[PDB]
Design a protein around this ligand. Structure first.
Ligand SMILES: [Mg+2]
Ligand SMILES: [Mg+2]
Ligand SMILES: [Mg+2]
Ligand SMILES: [Mg+2]
Ligand SMILES: [Mg+2]
Ligand SMILES: [Mg+2]
Ligand SMILES: [Mg+2]
Ligand SMILES: [Mg+2]
Ligand SMILES: [Mg+2]
Ligand SMILES: [Mg+2]
Ligand SMILES: [Mg+2]
Ligand SMILES: [Mg+2]
Ligand SMILES: [Mg+2]
Ligand SMILES: [Mg+2]
Ligand SMILES: [Mg+2]
Ligand SMILES: [Mg+2]
Ligand SMILES: [Mg+2]
Ligand SMILES: [Mg+2]
Ligand SMILES: [Mg+2]
Ligand SMILES: [Mg+2]
Lengths: 91, 97, 252, 54, 48, 69
RNA sequence: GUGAAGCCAGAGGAAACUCUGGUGGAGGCUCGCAGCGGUUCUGACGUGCAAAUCGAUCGUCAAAUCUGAGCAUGGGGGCGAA
RNA sequence: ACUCGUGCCCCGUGUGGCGAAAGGGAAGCCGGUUAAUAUUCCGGCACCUGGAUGUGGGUUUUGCGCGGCAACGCAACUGAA
RNA sequence: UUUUUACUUAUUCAAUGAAGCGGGGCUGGACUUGCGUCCAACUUCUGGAGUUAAGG
């Protein structure tokens, strides 16, 4: 079944706070409650514990991530840039 | 290399392999392992242990660039595989290089 | 008239920051011989949530160069850091995320966190979630380094100042609406007694410069001079301009 | 406070790091220590043979 | 109560050998769905 | 010419201390032991419940000084 | 009482995602008892039981809910969802 | 370390108090008993902490237990900084 | 006379358990031809261990 047309996870808020605010909250809530594959062990068991803290239930590893996503695009771009600018210094 | 996937598919189709850490260690101990594959995201301690076992067995090691998910998919399974051993390479030439 | 709320806040009392659930301040290691000449290796034991702080903290254990003990430090966690990770702090440390390096040994264009204003101060700049300091340039003869701050300002710090390679974890925390008075209350209940806030125009003349009147109105220009007396500084202090910002701003 | 009145064998298990470690961690420690010392020995011998050969 | 009854019956049948593991698994998923309204319905489905 | 200091911290050196040897006692006569037995025990209690336990339990009830243990 | 995500099964279709039974147990959601409060009777009383109470009727009732003890802020000062 | 207190030798980064009869925290149960107290008295049956030295047991005599593949077990089964 | 920039000891700030600051000289090197100068001091595969010094 579907149980809902568009409100999705944001249906717990009823008719309150306004549609635009409900959509904005839903956008972050979906990613913040989603499950993620562990980079270290490969299991789909990484979940958010605190605002910027993501832990794997299987391999028990904890990593520092984004507020509502495990990795932010800024950090990914910074990692790529760091690798490039470090390799051009090393060799 | 990219050809490792085709070689692995041929080896599984024709020869025989063991998938998993315990079976790989058993093969290395018994000396019937011809080559071992270790996934990139294998834990460092386990990877070093497997490398030491293969040094003892004089068995070649290939460091598969993919994760355990990708290694299992290459082996044609629906589960992950952190490490595996090839006990018999058949029509494939995986042991040539 | 009365002493206004902004004046009362500086007395302390009920406006003191809450500290029970805060375990330790987030600081670098003290600048020592190992960090000055080579590098030292530390192990990340845990990534913890610090109440009142958006960014997570990292507990990192080091060995004492001079004693058999071991020392646990509390760093601001950079995003990508994980438990069981080796981090390296020193002049000769590798240029990887989480390593603490002096700005002299860092190329131009890299971002760092918890940058020291002066070497040995254990971190002052760019220590909030999603924030960082960019290494704009170097002046080796002067022994200094130009950096760009989160606010957009340009600063010059001695090249011996240290920073942690990467971006502070905690991502886009302010990307989701608080959506609820309770959530604002929970946010501030571990920081300070500053919420909720009553508007000055809703007060009486005894309580605030914006005072009373038969309509809720300020009644005089809300921009207040930089050298106004204490008790007068309510509104927009030393405002260069007012109104909606309708374009790019020359200042940065 | 109750641990002060029961005997040591009931308070510990008979192996290295009997209490405070779970055994799997002890095995991991043993294997890791052996591998790091082996790697250190071969690294020092390689550095001596390939950087001090002249 | 219904789910416990159905799973108990499925375990009993698998242990006795009336059903193999594949039929047991598909029947378990059908019973997690709303397919069988009572033990009698499950038994009739199993026999068919 | 200077002694080796293996610690970067300076500690006050330990010096000789002497016990007091006064040339006059501050008090001449030490006080007699206060709260002797004659002050500790005042008188027995002879109420109904006090006399009951003399037979039922082989105990004597006394009124004693308040600061006696 | 309602029944948000997540999950199971079955129907369509070509796709992609549509639909239908269930499961589940979210929400500064809701009816309502105690507690907390105090809308109306502009009721009782109004030299009172009471220097603010009594009755009926009402608001809220799982969280900006109610509350004890310890502690802090002291008079042009404090504290103030004002 | 001496007949005798006072002769030395090591470690050191720290170096106060008050503040909870609802927080933390060593250990007591049942039956009976008075006009009035009782988890406090009486009877029975226990526990904890501290200090002392015994009997048995265990271990060893160039030394500090044994068993189980293992998870661990067994009445102990040396251990300063 | 006025301005600018030099010194450090007055004064001010910061860190630390007030450990390695400043000059050298022994070695290791890599760069250069009236054999002359610059750099450096041994830790980066692994969530192990590192103390109460071995030796001459
Ligand atoms: Mg005033
Ligand atoms: Mg307001
Ligand atoms: Mg008003
Ligand atoms: Mg005024
Ligand atoms: Mg004014
Ligand atoms: Mg208005
Ligand atoms: Mg006007
Ligand atoms: Mg409600
Ligand atoms: Mg009431
Ligand atoms: Mg009235
Ligand atoms: Mg009347
Ligand atoms: Mg009333
Ligand atoms: Mg009526
Ligand atoms: Mg006290
Ligand atoms: Mg208590
Ligand atoms: Mg007793
Ligand atoms: Mg008794
Ligand atoms: Mg005892
Ligand atoms: Mg004996
Ligand atoms: Mg040489």
């Amino acid at each position: 079944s579907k149980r809902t047309k568009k409100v999705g996870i944001s249906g717990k808020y009823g008719t309150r706070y306004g549609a635009s605010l409900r959509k904005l909250v839903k956008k972050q809530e979906v990613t913040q409650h989603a499950r993620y594959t562990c980079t270290f062990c490969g299991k789909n068991s990484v979940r958010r514990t605190a605002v910027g803290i993501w832990s794997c239930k299987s391999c028990k590893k904890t990593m520092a991530g984004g507020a509502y996503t495990v990795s932010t695009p800024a950090a990914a771009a910074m990692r790529s840039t760091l690798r490039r600018l470090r390799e051009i210094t090393e060799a | 290399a990219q050809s490792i996937g085709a070689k692995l598919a041929l080896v599984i189709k024709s020869g025989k392999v063991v998938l998993g850490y315990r079976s790989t260690l058993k093969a290395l101990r018994s000396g019937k392992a011809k080559l071992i594959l270790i996934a990139a995201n294998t834990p460092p301690l386990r990877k070093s242990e497997l490398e030491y076992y293969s040094m003892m067995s004089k068995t070649p090691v290939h460091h598969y660039s993919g994760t355990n998910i990708e290694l299992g998919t290459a082996c044609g399974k629906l589960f992950r595989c952190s490490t595996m051993a090839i006990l018999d390479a058949g029509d494939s030439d995986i042991l040539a290089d | 008239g009365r002493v206004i709320r902004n004046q009362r806040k500086g007395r302390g009392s009920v406006f003191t920051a809450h500290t029970r659930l805060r375990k330790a301040p987030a600081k670098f290691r003290p600048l020592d011989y190992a960090e000055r000449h080579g590098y030292i290796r530390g192990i990340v034991k845990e990534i913890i949530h610090d109440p009142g702080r958006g960014a997570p903290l990292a507990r990192v254990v080091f060995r004492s160069p001079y004693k058999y003990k071991q020392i646990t430090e509390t760093f601001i966690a950079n995003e990508g850091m994980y438990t069981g990770q080796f981090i390296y702090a020193g002049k000769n440390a590798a240029l990887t995320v989480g390593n603490i390096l002096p700005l002299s040994s860092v190329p131009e264009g890299t971002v760092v966190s918890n940058v020291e204003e002066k070497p040995g101060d254990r971190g002052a700049l760019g220590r909030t979630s999603g924030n960082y300091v960019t290494v704009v340039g170097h002046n080796p003869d002067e022994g200094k380094t130009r950096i760009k701050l989160p606010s957009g300002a340009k600063k010059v710090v001695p090249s011996s100042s240290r920073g942690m390679i990467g971006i502070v974890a905690g991502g886009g925390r302010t990307d989701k609406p608080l959506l609820k008075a309770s959530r604002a209350k929970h946010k501030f209940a571990v920081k300070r007694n500053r919420w909720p806030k009553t508007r000055g125009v809703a007060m009486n003349p005894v309580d605030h410069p914006h005072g009373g009147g038969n309509h809720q109105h300020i009644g005089k220009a809300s921009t207040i001079s930089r050298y106004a007396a204490q008790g007068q500084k309510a509104g927009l202090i030393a405002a260069r301009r007012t109104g909606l910002l309708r374009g790019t701003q020359k200042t940065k | 406070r109750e641990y002060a009145t029961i005997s040591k064998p009931k308070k510990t298990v008979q192996r290295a790091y009997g209490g405070s470690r779970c055994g799997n961690c002890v095995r991991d420690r043993i294997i890791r220590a052996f591998l790091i010392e082996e790697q250190k020995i071969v690294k020092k011998v390689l550095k001596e043979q390939s950087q001090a050969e002249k | 109560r219904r789910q416990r009854v159905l799973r108990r019956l499925l375990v009993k049948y698998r242990a006795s050998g009336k059903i193999d593991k594949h039929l047991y698994h598909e029947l378990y998923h059908l019973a997690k769905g709303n397919t069988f309204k009572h033990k009698r319905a499950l038994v009739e489905h199993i026999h068919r | 010419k200077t002694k080796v200091r293996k610690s970067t911290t300076f500690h006050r050196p330990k010096t000789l201390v002497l016990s007091r040897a006064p040339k006059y006692p501050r008090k001449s006569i030490p006080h007699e032991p206060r709260l002797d037995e004659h002050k500790i025990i005042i008188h027995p209690l002879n109420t109904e419940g006090a006399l009951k336990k003399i037979e039922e339990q082989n105990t004597l009830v006394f009124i004693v000084d308040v600061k006696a243990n």
